[PDB]
Amino acid sequence: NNYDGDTVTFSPTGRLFQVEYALEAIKQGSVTVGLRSNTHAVLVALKRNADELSSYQKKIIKCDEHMGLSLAGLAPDARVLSNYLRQQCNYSSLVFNRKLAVERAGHLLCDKAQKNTQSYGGRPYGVGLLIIGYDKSGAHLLEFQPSGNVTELYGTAIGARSQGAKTYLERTLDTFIKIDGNPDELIKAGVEAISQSLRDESLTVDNLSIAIVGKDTPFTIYDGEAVAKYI
Amino acid sequence: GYDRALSIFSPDGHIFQVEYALEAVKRGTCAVGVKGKNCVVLGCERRSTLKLQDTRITPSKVSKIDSHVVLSFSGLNADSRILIEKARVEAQSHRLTLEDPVTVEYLTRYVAGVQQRYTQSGGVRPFGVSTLIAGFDPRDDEPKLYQTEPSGIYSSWSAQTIGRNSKTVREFLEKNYDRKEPPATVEECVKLTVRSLLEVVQTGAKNIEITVVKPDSDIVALSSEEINQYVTQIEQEKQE
Amino acid sequence: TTTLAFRFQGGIIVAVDSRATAGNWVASQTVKKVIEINPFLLGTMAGGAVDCQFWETWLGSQCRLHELREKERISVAAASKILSNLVYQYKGAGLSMGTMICGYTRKEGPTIYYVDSDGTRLKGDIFCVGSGQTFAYGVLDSNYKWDLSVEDALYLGKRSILAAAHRDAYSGGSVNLYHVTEDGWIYHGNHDVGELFWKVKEEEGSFNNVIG
Amino acid sequence: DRGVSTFSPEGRLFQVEYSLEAIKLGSTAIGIATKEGVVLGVEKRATSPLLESDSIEKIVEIDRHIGCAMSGLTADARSMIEHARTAAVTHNLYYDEDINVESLTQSVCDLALRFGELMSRPFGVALLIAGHDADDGYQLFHAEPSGTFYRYNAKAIGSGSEGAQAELLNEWHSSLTLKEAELLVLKILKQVMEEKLDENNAQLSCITKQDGFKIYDNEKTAELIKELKEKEAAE
Amino acid sequence: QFNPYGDNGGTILGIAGEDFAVLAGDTRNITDYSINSRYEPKVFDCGDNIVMSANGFAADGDALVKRFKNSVKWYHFDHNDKKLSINSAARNIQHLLYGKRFFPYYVHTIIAGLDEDGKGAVYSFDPVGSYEREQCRAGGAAASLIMPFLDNQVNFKNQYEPGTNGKVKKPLKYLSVEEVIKLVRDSFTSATERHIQVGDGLEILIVTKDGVRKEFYELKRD
Amino acid sequence: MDIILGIRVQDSVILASSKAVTRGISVLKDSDDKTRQLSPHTLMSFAGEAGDTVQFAEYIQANIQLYSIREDYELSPQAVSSFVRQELAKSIRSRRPYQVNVLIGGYDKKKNKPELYQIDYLGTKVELPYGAHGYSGFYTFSLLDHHYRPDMTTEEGLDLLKLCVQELEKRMPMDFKGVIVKIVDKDGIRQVDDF
Amino acid sequence: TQQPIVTGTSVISMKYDNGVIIAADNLGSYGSLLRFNGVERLIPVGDNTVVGISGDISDMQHIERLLKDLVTENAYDNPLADAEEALEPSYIFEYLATVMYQRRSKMNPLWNAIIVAGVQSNGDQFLRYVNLLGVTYSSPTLATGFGAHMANPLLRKVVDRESDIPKTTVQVAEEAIVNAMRVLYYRDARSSRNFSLAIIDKNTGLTFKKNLQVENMKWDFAKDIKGYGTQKI
Amino acid sequence: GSRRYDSRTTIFSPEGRLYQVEYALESISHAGTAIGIMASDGIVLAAERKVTSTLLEQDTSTEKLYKLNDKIAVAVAGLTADAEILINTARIHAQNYLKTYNEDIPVEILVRRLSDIKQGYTQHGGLRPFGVSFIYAGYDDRYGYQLYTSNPSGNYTGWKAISVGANTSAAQTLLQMDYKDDMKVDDAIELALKTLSKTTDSSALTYDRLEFATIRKGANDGEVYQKIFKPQEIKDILVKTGIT
Ligand SMILES: *[B]([O])([O])[C]([C][C]([C])[C])[N]C(=O)[C]([C]C1=[C][C]=[C][C]=[C]1)[N]C(=O)C1=[C]N=[C][C]=N1
Ligand SMILES: [Mg+2]
Ligand SMILES: [Mg+2]
Ligand SMILES: [Mg+2]
């Protein structure tokens, strides 16, 4: 109200409204789902088009051979943050000959987003990210919020109508975690999860975007007729 | 440093500081530009509220940017000096590096770029100035006349006016200027420029300045008596 | 290195050798010492290989940006001065360049500028640059006229490089010929000195000193 | 007052949303992508008959394989074009090749959100970036001041955009020829323009693999306008 | 006074075939009159069907290769996983080298692969970034021993056809991958005999449309 | 470059400057004009290190031309010479100094007097009746000491200048390929095409 | 640019079937003066890596602090700091190798020759060298300074190539290392009798041996040597 | 943050006026009147000190008339402290020009420089403008005797006779009435004092409420002399002209 003019101002109940408004931009964004087993981690993203002549906005970005994310909200902010991750993954490789841990990648994103919430002049990031990866401690899935809060999960979903996919994963928890050494079945579960967040529209060939990383699987993105198999 | 964003968008998609800079131009004394077949003429209004002035030393309204290009303006006088100085420096810089004087279009593009930069730079307000830039490209006999404005847009004009009551003199020029046959001589071009100012000026005494620019760096400013002869001839034909 | 360029009736002739050395070691016999800056501008290369290469292809980027911005072909004067002003900033740092910027425009006609890593920029009708420049000058100055045919001018340039290729130990390999008109440059082939020498000797009756 | 980079309660940047309103006031620009090339057309919209219309430059060359049309506060576009041209040339210098149209567009869009309290406000101009490369062929992009860019088969921006976009919705198909696209841009421009369309107040351009980016002469466009009138009177 | 440069010896060799390319290099690493390693790989697969080697001062060599590999990675990120062509890689390397014009990478760089028409390609660089596409190039310590042999046996220089006596040249017939590898092995065997910094092992990387293959051969260890 | 001379007579200043441009081994050009017009009644000749000479001259030229446009007025030769001296005096303590020596010949329209200034790369200014830079003065000053009279005509000045150039052509080792002569007077600057 | 003041001499090392051995004497020389007799030049990092450093001792102590700080930093926000995400020999080396090359590139080198010996997560032997110039190389045997000239020849007789590594036991390898240290004591004028030895085995872990001495030395034959040629008494 | 408290000194009004410049001009309109009159053989500068006291040390006091160099002087109207900042800058500029070209600075060039500085404070920096208006009285060998004025906007103009500060409307009318082109310094002295005497808000015009100066070629042969009048000399000229 009077305490939402900038990020440097707490409200009387201890709230940061600019951060909460940035959080709101994620809810307006298109749905994306993340889930993992012990061997593989999968991202599924519903891409959004402007109209029928337009292309479908890309939702998934590769950060390294073993790590990448899907976005929901302001896409340019995701580009800034994914670029930062690319650099941090790259610094770890060049200097330490070491693949960056997915947990440490989350810690770095948290700290970058935080600085924008405490300083005058700047603004919070207006995007939510789902980071998947496979490192020395197996498969991982993270959820990044622009408040700074990063959370390691078995599965999750962010964006519009994401509550439907999140409930499905909460039921299927015991099933999909056990899908080891079977990428296609893990993607199926992800495609079935994101389907719980659909209304009116359905998953078409240029609508769906899938990514996967695992034990002997580099981070690869599937678009177009490559995902027709899963429709 | 002072970084405050002064020029910003409003809900209806307007940058008020740029638009308020145009209002400063509207206040400024009238300036007119007319190009003939082999010449360009720049007319300028001098408000007669200020007498006891020393016309020898008072800053003239038309300024030479180089030996072949001139710049007149309407709006804030102090602001115009900054644009003129930058333009003169860029004119010499262009000769130094390209080994050729600026084209009138290039010089206009530069001045317009400066004006634009001041509409999305922090800590600065836009220039309260619109300019008329006229001249002849090196080794070219085609007349050139361009206009700029605070927003940074620019364009070429067969004839144009800016400043106070510019709506009236633009009305005059739109009906009196023929594109198929422009003022063939210097006389015809100056006469049309004086006529257009006489719609607005008041008295045709020391209130009208005329500057004629011809090809190959031939620039001259008309005196009071020379202009007064045009004023005399125009009204004597009008009494009919 | 031997490079030359000269103005004449039919435009400009540019001729260069092909050798590159590191001390007495012949590093390459197939070096392209002429840069195709655009369809109308040529640059010659002498001195430091990389300095010439890097900054002359850079020059082409600056010329392209000029004609994008000004909607007009860049002049030979302006193009040469961009390069000379650039190297002048680096003066003292140790750049090593001897270049001719050759082109034709409407306003200038055929024009040649000698540009130099010491900052020297000279307009002229004839220039020879490199370790074998003196040898090329001998043939050029005694046979040059304004009224030469494109065919005869091309041969004189070819012959002047050959003269230097023979005597100068740091010149040789082959001869690259270019002919610059008002519709652009026209390449006139790579001519191996190992075959050209014996051909010229026989046909011209020259080099009677050498036994063949 | 309030921050320049402030979020609204709906989760939108105020300044970005206000700059979009400025673009709606701008003159119409239309782009149509085909397998034979991409066509770019604009409304010149001279404020007075004394203004020499050929000096209105709302279609611009970025490189030989990339063109660009603009709509909105066109003065803001000059630094965007300069950056685009420099990016295109610089990439050729570093990699000895043409730059991808998408990569060029992405480079331009990186400037968009570099505003705060960097420049003091977003750009008040939208761009249609049309081009060709070997990998993705003929492409048309819509670059906004939000930093977002969408690829399009056809797109209209400016004052007559939603009316023109609805028309492009019906008319576009994947087998359009270049000649058909040229007439289609002229047809839709004539529909949404206030003044009557002719060769002086409207401009065409195209980008083909063979000839590259070309702005059309007023004589060439005049014939296409005459060809349009006859084919509309034909039924 | 501190000398930031050193000489790690070694020798490399690139040969471009009709539809293939090879980049070979010995595996010996030295300082002065001591052997550091008998097997220290010098030729690297940099991705996109490009092989590279920066021979001379190994620290600058490793730094350059590391930075080019990095450049390939970021080329994929910035340009939608587009394949970096060999000519584009070469120009990119020129800028990497010239970036340190006034404190040079003290190395002799060679890359090999296939051009966009599928033909064999070898590019050669000096320490400060001047480059040129070539059919044949040896680099490093024993380059002076090997290049003349390659002028003769790859480009058939100074060779003519019997009976004509200097009139007709030997025709420039193309060489197979088996024929090139023979010339590479004989080049390094000969270089090992007369150059003290060459020996221990020979590692050859062969580039075709099918990918990058490796071959290793023993060299004399004295 | 090599030889630059200057002589101030009754009603004009005459500057003579060699045409040769020699780069080490070869004479690359024999028609080089080692001078720049700073203003309609002020001419500057120059000689020094390659590149620096022209870069400096054109930089000075640009600055004076800028002044001329701003004030719609021509600076006096004295004023221009003082500006030039300051630039060189600033330059000598720079990271990389301009290695340029100059002669500034001008006609002061206010005082109706020709003026010749000699300035070296250190910023050492002197007003003279006749001047030179480099080894030229060693041969020419003796002749000028003898023959110069201050009421000389322009034609007498040119004859005395020919006697200087002849002595240089006789006794100097370097072939400077003759000189380009320019006269600065009340009517402006003109070049003597036959010398 | 500097000059080394207090210096440490040879560091010698080799691979064997199940791991690596590394050794270095306990001397800190001050030119020809054998100034400091209790200097440890083998510095362990975790239970899987030992960094052996020669050259300038002030720069060694600086490097020692960087490695100490590296362990601290790795533990931060790392629940697997003593397990899957523990520091590897390859991580520690590449870090040092980066620093060494950066410092030489600023013309202000750490005046050292470093050998990182250890065993990786998968049981692989790690042994690699780096020095003040940023030059890096790996080999079945590695040695710095005088060790390069005298130790390597002896150690290469045990492991001449890669295929000799599985055939070499820890007893044979240690014996060779200890013999090499004796030879260096005979012949290096800036060496000491006292040294430290470290064994990093993939089964038995890190064994760090301090206060070792060169023993079984041959000197008796000196009594028979008289004069420099012709002298008999 | 800090934005909350920013006055924004360099913005346009909806009408296209610079708020702070307009308000600075309002400030100057309450300052003591200063008058400049240019004649064929010299320039006069007259100025009224603001409601003084009997205990003010007048002979060592200077609030209106300042010397920039030997050829140029200024009359001040507005904040004296602001004026002294600009005066010291102007004095330095004149010396910089002298050192560079070895010639005294032309009047207009000095005036343009100060006016450009004032302009800067209206367009960038977020600082308040200088609440000062100058009358420049100077001489050079190009244009001879010159009168200029500059104001907080940074706009300057040339004059034959001009007033700044209080009652300029009334003062300018009186000058416009009695001024003639062939006028001389002694006549201009009389006109300046008569104008102040009529426009003054005080009951009577006296020597202790005035600062006075003349720039004359009335110096021995072709050269210019500045004369800052002393209290006794102002008292004499007041009697001579017949005001007291
Ligand atoms: B030419 O001889 O000047 C030649 C021209 C260059 C463009 C290839 N330069 C060189 O051969 C130079 C050495 C040199 C010899 C004689 C005069 C000046 C310079 N060689 C190199 O620059 C070079 C580059 N890469 C490898 C080996 N040598
Ligand atoms: Mg030779
Ligand atoms: Mg040996
Ligand atoms: Mg001197």
GROMACS .gro file of C-alpha atoms in nm, chain A residues 8-116:
model
  109
    8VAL     CA    1   1.399  -0.156   0.054
    9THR     CA    2   1.076  -0.111   0.258
   10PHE     CA    3   0.922  -0.357   0.506
   11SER     CA    4   0.548  -0.328   0.570
   12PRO     CA    5   0.414  -0.298   0.929
   13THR     CA    6   0.351  -0.677   0.933
   14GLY     CA    7   0.708  -0.748   0.813
   15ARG     CA    8   0.627  -0.810   0.446
   16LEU     CA    9   0.821  -0.712   0.133
   17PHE     CA   10   0.556  -0.625  -0.125
   18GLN     CA   11   0.789  -0.578  -0.424
   19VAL     CA   12   0.914  -0.933  -0.367
   20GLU     CA   13   0.553  -1.055  -0.341
   21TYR     CA   14   0.464  -0.870  -0.662
   22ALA     CA   15   0.762  -1.037  -0.832
   23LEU     CA   16   0.627  -1.370  -0.700
   24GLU     CA   17   0.296  -1.280  -0.868
   25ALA     CA   18   0.466  -1.259  -1.210
   26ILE     CA   19   0.549  -1.631  -1.177
   27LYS     CA   20   0.183  -1.726  -1.119
   28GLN     CA   21   0.093  -1.546  -1.445
   29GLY     CA   22   0.359  -1.750  -1.629
   30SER     CA   23   0.291  -2.075  -1.814
   31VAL     CA   24   0.303  -2.403  -1.620
   32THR     CA   25   0.621  -2.610  -1.593
   33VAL     CA   26   0.681  -2.937  -1.407
   34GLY     CA   27   0.992  -3.092  -1.251
   35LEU     CA   28   1.043  -3.443  -1.111
   36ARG     CA   29   1.316  -3.702  -1.057
   37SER     CA   30   1.400  -4.063  -0.975
   38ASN     CA   31   1.733  -4.193  -0.837
   39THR     CA   32   1.889  -4.223  -1.185
   40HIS     CA   33   1.726  -3.944  -1.390
   41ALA     CA   34   1.574  -3.597  -1.350
   42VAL     CA   35   1.309  -3.459  -1.587
   43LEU     CA   36   1.175  -3.115  -1.675
   44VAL     CA   37   0.842  -3.077  -1.856
   45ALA     CA   38   0.730  -2.731  -1.969
   46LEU     CA   39   0.410  -2.605  -2.131
   47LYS     CA   40   0.527  -2.339  -2.378
   48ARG     CA   41   0.305  -2.036  -2.446
   49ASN     CA   42   0.241  -1.861  -2.780
   50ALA     CA   43   0.136  -1.500  -2.846
   51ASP     CA   44  -0.105  -1.609  -3.120
   52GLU     CA   45  -0.136  -1.867  -3.404
   53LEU     CA   46   0.122  -1.692  -3.628
   54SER     CA   47   0.372  -1.668  -3.340
   55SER     CA   48   0.621  -1.923  -3.209
   56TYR     CA   49   0.594  -2.087  -2.868
   57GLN     CA   50   0.820  -1.914  -2.612
   58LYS     CA   51   1.107  -2.143  -2.507
   59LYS     CA   52   1.092  -2.243  -2.140
   60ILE     CA   53   1.399  -2.465  -2.089
   61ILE     CA   54   1.763  -2.348  -2.079
   62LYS     CA   55   2.079  -2.561  -2.062
   63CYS     CA   56   2.342  -2.452  -1.806
   64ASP     CA   57   2.598  -2.733  -1.838
   65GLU     CA   58   2.636  -3.092  -1.965
   66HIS     CA   59   2.494  -3.210  -1.630
   67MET     CA   60   2.259  -2.924  -1.532
   68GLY     CA   61   1.981  -2.699  -1.663
   69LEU     CA   62   1.651  -2.532  -1.573
   70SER     CA   63   1.298  -2.443  -1.684
   71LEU     CA   64   1.153  -2.094  -1.633
   72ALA     CA   65   0.819  -1.932  -1.546
   73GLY     CA   66   0.775  -1.553  -1.544
   74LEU     CA   67   0.996  -1.281  -1.694
   75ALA     CA   68   1.207  -1.464  -1.954
   76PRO     CA   69   1.484  -1.199  -1.968
   77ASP     CA   70   1.539  -1.241  -1.592
   78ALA     CA   71   1.572  -1.617  -1.648
   79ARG     CA   72   1.830  -1.541  -1.917
   80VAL     CA   73   2.030  -1.329  -1.670
   81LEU     CA   74   2.014  -1.597  -1.398
   82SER     CA   75   2.081  -1.890  -1.634
   83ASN     CA   76   2.380  -1.699  -1.773
   84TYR     CA   77   2.507  -1.657  -1.416
   85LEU     CA   78   2.467  -2.032  -1.357
   86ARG     CA   79   2.647  -2.107  -1.683
   87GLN     CA   80   2.939  -1.894  -1.560
   88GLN     CA   81   2.945  -2.053  -1.212
   89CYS     CA   82   2.929  -2.406  -1.356
   90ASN     CA   83   3.207  -2.299  -1.592
   91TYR     CA   84   3.423  -2.143  -1.319
   92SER     CA   85   3.398  -2.469  -1.122
   93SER     CA   86   3.514  -2.670  -1.426
   94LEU     CA   87   3.801  -2.444  -1.536
   95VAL     CA   88   3.948  -2.367  -1.192
   96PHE     CA   89   3.876  -2.687  -0.994
   97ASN     CA   90   3.818  -2.940  -1.277
   98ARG     CA   91   3.497  -3.010  -1.089
   99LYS     CA   92   3.133  -3.031  -1.197
  100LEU     CA   93   2.930  -2.783  -0.990
  101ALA     CA   94   2.704  -2.946  -0.730
  102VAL     CA   95   2.331  -2.886  -0.788
  103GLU     CA   96   2.286  -2.791  -0.421
  104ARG     CA   97   2.569  -2.536  -0.445
  105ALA     CA   98   2.416  -2.401  -0.769
  106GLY     CA   99   2.097  -2.332  -0.572
  107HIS     CA  100   2.293  -2.156  -0.296
  108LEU     CA  101   2.452  -1.926  -0.556
  109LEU     CA  102   2.114  -1.836  -0.710
  110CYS     CA  103   1.968  -1.765  -0.364
  111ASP     CA  104   2.248  -1.521  -0.280
  112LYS     CA  105   2.226  -1.344  -0.617
  113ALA     CA  106   1.850  -1.290  -0.588
  114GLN     CA  107   1.885  -1.178  -0.224
  115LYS     CA  108   2.109  -0.878  -0.302
  116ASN     CA  109   1.832  -0.739  -0.524
   0.00000   0.00000   0.00000
